[PDB]
Amino acid sequence: GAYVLDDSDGLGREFDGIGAVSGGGATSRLLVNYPEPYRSEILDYLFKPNFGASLHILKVEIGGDGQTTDGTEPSHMHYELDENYFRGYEWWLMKEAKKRNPDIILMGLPWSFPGWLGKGFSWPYVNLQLTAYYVVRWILGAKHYHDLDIDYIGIWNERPFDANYIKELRKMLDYQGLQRVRIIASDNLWEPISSSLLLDQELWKVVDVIGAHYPGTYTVWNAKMSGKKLWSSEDFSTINSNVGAGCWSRILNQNYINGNMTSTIAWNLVASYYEELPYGRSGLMTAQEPWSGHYVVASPIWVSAHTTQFTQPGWYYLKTVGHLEKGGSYVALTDGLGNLTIIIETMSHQHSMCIRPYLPYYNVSHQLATFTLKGSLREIQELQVWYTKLGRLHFKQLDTLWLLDGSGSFTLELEEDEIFTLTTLTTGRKGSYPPPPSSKPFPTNYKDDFNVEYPLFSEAPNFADQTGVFEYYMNNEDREHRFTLRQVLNQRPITWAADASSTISVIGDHHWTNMTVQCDVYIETPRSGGVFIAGRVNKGGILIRSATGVFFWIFANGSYRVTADLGGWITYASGHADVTAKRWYTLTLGIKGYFAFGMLNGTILWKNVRVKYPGHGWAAIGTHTFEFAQFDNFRVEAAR
Numbered sequence: 001g002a003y004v005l006d007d008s009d010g011l012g013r014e015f016d017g018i019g020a021v022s023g024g025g026a027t028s029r030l031l032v033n034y035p036e037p038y039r040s041e042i043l044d045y046l047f048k049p050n051f052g053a054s055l056h057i058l059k060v061e062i063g064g065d066g067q068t069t070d071g072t073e074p075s076h077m078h079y080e081l082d083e084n085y086f087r088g089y090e091w092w093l094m095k096e097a098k099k100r101n102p103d104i105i106l107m108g109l110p111w112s113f114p115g116w117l118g119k120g121f122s123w124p125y126v127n128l129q130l131t132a133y134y135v136v137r138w139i140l141g142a143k144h145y146h147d148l149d150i151d152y153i154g155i156w157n158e159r160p161f162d163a164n165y166i167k168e169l170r171k172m173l174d175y176q177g178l179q180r181v182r183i184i185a186s187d188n189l190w191e192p193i194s195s196s197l198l199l200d201q202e203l204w205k206v207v208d209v210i211g212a213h214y215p216g217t218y219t220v221w222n223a224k225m226s227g228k229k230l231w232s233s234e235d236f237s238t239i240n241s242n243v244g245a246g247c248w249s250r251i252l253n254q255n256y257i258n259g260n261m262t263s264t265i266a267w268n269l270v271a272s273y274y275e276e277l278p279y280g281r282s283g284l285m286t287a288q289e290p291w292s293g294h295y296v297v298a299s300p301i302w303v304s305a306h307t308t309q310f311t312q313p314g315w316y317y318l319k320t321v322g323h324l325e326k327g328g329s330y331v332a333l334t335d336g337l338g339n340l341t342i343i344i345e346t347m348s349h350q351h352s353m354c355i356r357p358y359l360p361y362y363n364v365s366h367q368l369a370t371f372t373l374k375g376s377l378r379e380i381q382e383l384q385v386w387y388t389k390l391g392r393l394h395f396k397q398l399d400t401l402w403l404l405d406g407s408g409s410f411t412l413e414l415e416e417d418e419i420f421t422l423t424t425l426t427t428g429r430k431g432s433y434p435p436p437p438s439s440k441p442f443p444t445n446y447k448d449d450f451n452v453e454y455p456l457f458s459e460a461p462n463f464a465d466q467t468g469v470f471e472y473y474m475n476n477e478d479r480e481h482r483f484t485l486r487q488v489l490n491q492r493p494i495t496w497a498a499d500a501s502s503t504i505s506v507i508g509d510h511h512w513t514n515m516t517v518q519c520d521v522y523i524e525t526p527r528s529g530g531v532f533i534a535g536r537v538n539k540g541g542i543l544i545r546s547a548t549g550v551f552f553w554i555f556a557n558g559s560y561r562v563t564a565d566l567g568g569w570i571t572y573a574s575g576h577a578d579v580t581a582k583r584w585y586t587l588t589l590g591i592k593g594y595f596a597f598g599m600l601n602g603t604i605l606w607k608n609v610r611v612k613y614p615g616h617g618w619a620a621i622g623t624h625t626f627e628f629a630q631f632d633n634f635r636v637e638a639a640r
């Protein structure tokens with residue numbers, strides 16, 4: 001019936017911000033080659049203050065060369081003695097975020113690590129100082145090469161922590177002059193980090209924030225007892241339809257209400273990865289077509305706005321928040337400067353399911369809500385009103401609410417699936433750019449000769465690596481193949497996911513069913529080396545080991561194989577071929593209906609080989625193991 005909002009008996013917890021994750025893995029892969037103005041528009045929808053999602057926090061993966069959900073992301077140290085702070089796209093993204101919002105909060109977290117850190121094992125805690133040295137290098141590089149101040153550093157995403165590592169990471173941070181950098185742990189479940197912090201005082205000192213994943217709006221007792229800041233450091237991961245927008249809406253309020261969590265960070269920031277990759281379209285918005293410029297400003301953008309435009313890190317939650325009688329919730333925040341924000345949500349169970357965890361039914365029905373400004377809030381007379389209705393009307397400003405009394409009270413009619421933001425703030429705006437081009441399938445004729453001398457990014461556009469890492473490569477000591485694409489991993493990473501045994505990058509349209517793929521290939525390893533080109537590749541990401549399709553392999557021992565699977569268990573054809581290491585060959589692979597054929601240097605090697613049909617999927621290139629190889633003059637001709 002009546003709901004009191006008061007600051008007289010003090011304040012709730014400090015609000016730390018809403019944000020999103022770019023990474024885990026390659027989630028922003030297709031954003032980088034958007035043409036202007038569209039690329040800059042997308043970034044504004046995300047990061048420009050008083051405009052769109054206006055995010056307070058950007059968390060990114062510290063690439064470790066391993067597959068991390070929708071691809072691999074390049075590390076700053078591929079090998080021992082290697083340092084490079086210009087690979088990938090997270091540097092660029094952080095800088096674009098900071099350009100639009102100087103006060104944005106930056107976070108880094110590793111998912112995988114380069115294999116050499118493991119010194120013989122697939123384990124990052126073999127040499128604690130070495131792994132901490134690697135991580136801290138990254139933070140220094142952000143400052144030195146990009147003028148970026150990383151605010152938070154994590155441990156090992158969704159994987160075990162080592163208390164001695166966390167301590168060494170603190171010591172190393174301090175030693176390198178990074179006392180200001182905070183540590184968040186352990187980016188997994190509430191335990192065992194929470195009880196570890198109660199039993200170990202030295203550990204308690206070095207951990208600033210307990211970050212838990214997909215906590216279903218709740219925390220646990222040991223966490224409250226720690227007195228540490230509690231963040232949902234990874235949540236959401238839901239398709240960005242209205243259903244996903246409802247999930248985001250509900251958890252933004254209730255993570256604080258039910259679980260004392262003062263930050264929530266969505267995986268992921270923008271769906272800029274092929275949608276047939278795992279968890280397709282689970283970004284706050286969608287930008288998965290750089291070749292057309294088409295992007296979608298999805299519902300979750302506006303749900304974010306309802307909190308982000310009208311709150312800032314450093315504000316405080318009131319003590320007066322909770323659930324509504326007939327369902328839904330209300331939070332309220334101030335800033336100590338007389339401003340007040342009220343955010344109300346009425347998300348129906350049927351339209352707010354997150355993928356993790358799934359909630360048992362709860363009822364939401366028509367109701368009325370009365371709010372009374374008690375304490376030092378009563379002196380407010382006027383409130384701006386923002387309204388959103390899911391299922392649709394988005395982030396629409398409604399007529400101002402005048403209190404018009406001396407009461408300090410007001411009433412609302414609330415139906416289902418609604419968000420209301422009521423605030424003293426006048427800065428709100430539903431930012432708008434003209435509509436962008438219609439969606440178009442991936443070009444049915446496509447070529448890249450990789451002839452780019454000073455590339456802006458370290459890899460060619462649209463190639464999404466799924467195991468291994470492929471980079472622009474300049475080789476002055478050749479005139480015919482001076483500018484190529486090279487797979488640069490020479491050993492398996494400390495994997496997070498189950499990377500394939502062979503390297504692979506996919507490109508194009510997963511709907512393609514008839515296609516001709518051509519590429520110049522070059523094997524660097526004598527006797528043992530191997531490369532392939534492929535078509536109808538159907539799976540990638542965390543499922544890359546499962547990929548089927550048609551794979552045309554050539555080996556440096558003078559052999560070829562055609563397989564139905566990336567693991568090469570299922571043979572379509574095999575035989576001999578005039579192939580050695582360190583020689584350039586042109587490979588052609590034709591796939592049509594039930595039949596395939598392969599050419600070597602324009603000459604038929606095998607023809608009318610039966611493949612499974614129907615089948616559809618991307619084109620790809622790769623290497624037999626984690627080995628050096630080059631590719632040049634890539635072309636694809638395909639029918640969807």
Ligand SMILES: *[C@@H]1O[C@H](CO)[C@@H](O[C@@H]2O[C@H](CO)[C@@H](O)[C@H](O)[C@H]2NC(C)=O)[C@H](O)[C@H]1NC(C)=O
Nearest residue numbers: 013224225227256257258259260261319321322
């Ligand atoms: C964490 O938030 C919870 C609510 O989710 C607070 O626990 C109590 O909740 C009841 C019922 O909602 C309130 O009436 C009380 O005011 C709360 N009790 C306390 C401890 O004051 C709790 O305040 C929070 N826990 C903290 C901050 O340690």
Ligand SMILES: *[C@@H]1O[C@H](CO)[C@@H](O[C@@H]2O[C@H](CO)[C@@H](O)[C@H](O)[C@H]2NC(C)=O)[C@H](O)[C@H]1NC(C)=O
Nearest residue numbers: 312335336337338339340380423424425426427
């Ligand atoms: C409400 O919040 C706004 C946003 O901070 C406050 O506006 C700033 O206030 C400080 C001093 O209080 C000024 O130095 C800034 O220049 C102000 N910025 C703007 C946008 O004018 C404001 O003080 C708060 N109080 C209210 C209700 O106006």
Ligand SMILES: *[C@@H]1O[C@H](CO)[C@@H](O[C@@H]2O[C@H](CO)[C@@H](O)[C@H](O)[C@H]2NC(C)=O)[C@H](O)[C@H]1NC(C)=O
Nearest residue numbers: 512513514515591592593594595613638639640
């Ligand atoms: C891929 O190739 C197959 C084989 O050419 C195409 O399927 C044939 O389509 C014709 C009519 O268009 C039928 O009469 C044949 O019987 C089909 N072949 C088989 C074995 O089914 C198919 O249309 C092509 N797909 C696309 C979209 O390009």
Ligand SMILES: O=[N+]([O-])c1ccc(O[C@@H]2O[C@H](CO)[C@H](O)[C@H](O)[C@H]2O)cc1
Nearest residue numbers: 023024025068069157158234237267279
């Ligand atoms: O299998 N799980 O329950 C599971 C739960 C949380 C996980 O962490 C997260 O999942 C996300 C997808 O929803 C992304 O993969 C993200 O990269 C990963 O950190 C990964 C797997």
Ligand SMILES: *[C@@H]1O[C@H](CO)[C@@H](O)[C@H](O)[C@H]1NC(C)=O
Nearest residue numbers: 326327361362363364365366
């Ligand atoms: C939910 O609760 C309302 C009001 O109490 C009631 O009218 C309705 O039947 C309930 N719906 C279901 C299916 O639980």
Ligand SMILES: [Ca+2]
Nearest residue numbers: 449450451483
């Ligand atoms: Ca070239």
